[PDB]
């Protein structure tokens, strides 16, 4: 539930990136497929 930090976690299965909900409306979600 962080305001502006984007998590990267890499385990033995794969590696995923979590984005907080509060950043999806911003310009940071254009790569992740949310956008303005």
């Amino acid at each position: 539930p962080d305001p502006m930090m984007i998590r990267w976690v890499n385990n033995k299965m794969g590696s995923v990136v979590a984005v907080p909900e509060e950043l999806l409306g911003t310009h940071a979600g254009v790569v992740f497929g949310a956008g303005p």
Partner: protein, 439 residues
């Protein structure tokens, strides 16, 4: 490769009696100066006696630099050995005296010992939190050996090293906790079949056993000049490599000497005194000697060994002559070791050593002719004739060199004794101190 002093493997004396062997470890053919240099080497390895001066005087091409490299190979890579030439001191950046002071303080090693903390094990997961458009980073590293399963935290520099190394899940890394370097040793799994830009499959290592936090005691040797530069400047480090050090004031040296004495008493540091070799000291002027005579007055002066070539020469920056070009208030302090010119039964075996080093096979008639040439032109022409005759024998496809190859090389390349006559014959088509004509 094969330089002019690659056959030498030390000084070649005894360890109990230090008697000069007539043929041992390259330096073959001289006994007095090698025994005296063995005595100097033993009082350098003692390390107690500080501030002497050894002057290896003698004719040129007699092995003075050979004796210096013999002492250099005999100390090993522990004691500093500065190979200073006398013309390097005349800088335009810094003063002429401060270059000498740096040349003395480069030859006093300080050997300190410190404990680092190294890790070992297989990375299980990386967890990196990054901001958007500038900001701090957060890091959690889960690492596992065969016994422990730790979840460590990370700062900014550790993440800046992880992303530089690209440490994925399933790597055998070892992190020094103090210095903060990361060396990947290999992997335990295989390469995934899900991503494209992964990399190269590294060495297959198993999971390391033991513990995570292991301790290590490393030994670091820095000269006093490096301590002077890192303690003379606030941010301007790395100037001890790029030579950008302008001047170090005396308030810095008189504090670093006291702190090195305190480190010596505490058992933290140990002072290893070293050798300052000055090649062809006759080029220094009297303004250098008036400081060299007084820098050999303290507990932190290295045992100076230096060479010379000249007879009664005039000292630069003055108007008068002296033996060896050195002033007679400085020649009282020094101790002069003479070297003698060689004998042909020694030139024969010296050329044999130089031939066996450059991988050149000979015939005894060619070696006899080569010794006859070396009697009249020195070793410096004969060794060049050895290499040249090797390649001329390689051009005409011969196994061993012969008399004809040596005569060919003697015909092509003049020794200086014939080039002097070549100057003295045709003086009208060479620019003297005057005009010249063209046919």
């Amino acid at each position: 490769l094969i330089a002019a002093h690659s056959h030498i493997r030390g000084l070649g004396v005894d360890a109990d009696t230090l008697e000069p062997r007539p043929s041992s470890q390259g330096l073959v053919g001289q006994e007095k100066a090698r025994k005296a240099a063995a005595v100097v080497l033993e009082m350098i390895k003692q390390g107690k006696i500080a501030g002497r001066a050894v002057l290896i005087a003698g004719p040129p091409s007699t092995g003075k630099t050979a004796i210096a490299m013999g002492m250099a190979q005999s100390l090993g890579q522990d004691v500093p050995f500065t190979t200073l030439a006398a013309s390097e001191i005349f800088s335009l950046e810094m003063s002429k005296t401060e270059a000498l002071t740096q040349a003395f303080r480069k030859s006093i090693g300080v050997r300190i010992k410190e404990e680092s903390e190294i890790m070992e094990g297989e990375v299980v997961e990386i967890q990196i939190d990054r901001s958007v458009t500038g900001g701090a980073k957060q890091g959690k590293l889960t690492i596992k050996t065969t016994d422990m399963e730790a979840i460590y935290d990370m700062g900014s520099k550790m993440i800046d090293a992880m992303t530089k190394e690209r440490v994925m899940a399933g790597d055998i890394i070892s992190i020094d906790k103090s210095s903060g370097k990361i060396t990947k040793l290999g992997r335990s799994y295989a390469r995934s079949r899900d991503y494209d830009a992964m990399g190269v499959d590294t060495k297959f290592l198993q999971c390391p056993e033991g513990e995570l936090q292991k301790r290590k005691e490393v030994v670091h040797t820095v000269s006093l000049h490096e301590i002077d530069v890192i303690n003379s400047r606030t941010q301007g480090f790395l100037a001890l490599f790029s030579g950008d050090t302008g001047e170090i004031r005396s308030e810095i040296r008189d504090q670093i000497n006291t702190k090195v004495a305190e480190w010596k008493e505490e058992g933290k540091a140990e002072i290893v005194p070293g050798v300052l070799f000055i090649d062809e000291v006759h080029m220094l002027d009297i303004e250098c000697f008036s400081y060299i005579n007084r820098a050999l007055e303290s507990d932190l002066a290295p045992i100076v060994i230096m060479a010379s070539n000249r007879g009664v020469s005039r000292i630069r920056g003055t108007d008068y002559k002296s033996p060896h070009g050195l002033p007679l208030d400085f020649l009282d302090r020094v101790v002069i070791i003479n070297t003698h010119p060689y004998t042909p039964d020694e030139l024969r075996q010296i050329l044999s050593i130089r031939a066996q080093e450059e991988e050149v096979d000979l015939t005894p008639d060619a070696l006899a002719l080569l010794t006859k040439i070396g009697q009249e032109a020195g070793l410096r022409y004969a060794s060049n004739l050895i290499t040249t005759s090797q390649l001329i024998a390689a051009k005409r496809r011969a196994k061993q060199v012969g008399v004809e190859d040596v005569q060919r090389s003697f015909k092509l390349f003049y020794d200086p004794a014939r080039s002097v006559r070549f100057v003295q014959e045709s003086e009208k088509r060479l620019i003297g101190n005057d005009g010249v004509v063209d046919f």
